[PDB]
Amino acid sequence: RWDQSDLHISDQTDTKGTVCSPFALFAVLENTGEKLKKSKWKWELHKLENARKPLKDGNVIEKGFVSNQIGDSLYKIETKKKMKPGIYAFKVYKPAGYPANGSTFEWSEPMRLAKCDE
């Protein structure tokens, strides 16, 4: 660990079920003691085939660095566009450059966006 090591996704898009929406998804990372100081945390949004299984890598739609300071100790990441129906989640894995080994991934819980006139 180090100064910036404890950014956690403490808040996120609260659809949590079958919701029909055109919306930009977001996740909020709070540094719970270990303040973001050295560099920036790397994130990537995934299209997950299933939300009831342990979320997996391979499908990436959006990605970048957290950066956005929505509060002195609060950071935010969002999708650059309002997306089509599907299952999404944010996969952040510590500061950029850090070898992703030893369970360094933190998933935002899979939020589902639908678009269905049913």
Curated annotation (Swiss-Prot):
Explain the consequences of disrupting this gene: Mutation impairs colony surface architecture. Mutant produces fewer and altered amyloid fibers.
Entry function: Required for biofilm formation. Required for the proper anchoring and polymerization of TasA amyloid fibers at the cell surface. Is also a minor component of TasA fibers.
- Its gene name is tapA
Highest taxon of source? Bacteria
Coiled-coil positions are none
- Induction remarks: Part of the tapA-sipW-tasA operon. Expression is directly repressed by the DNA-binding protein master regulator of biofilm formation SinR and activated by the extracellular matrix regulatory protein RemA. Also positively regulated by the sporulation transcription factors sigma H and Spo0A and repressed by the transition phase regulatory protein AbrB, probably indirectly. Induced by a high concentration of salt. During most conditions of growth, may be present at very low levels or is not synthesized at all, due, at least in part, to post-transcriptional repression.
Q: Where in the cell is it found?
A: Secreted, Cell wall; Secreted
Protein name from the UniProt record: TasA anchoring/assembly protein
Complete protein: which residues are present?
A: 73 to 190 of 253
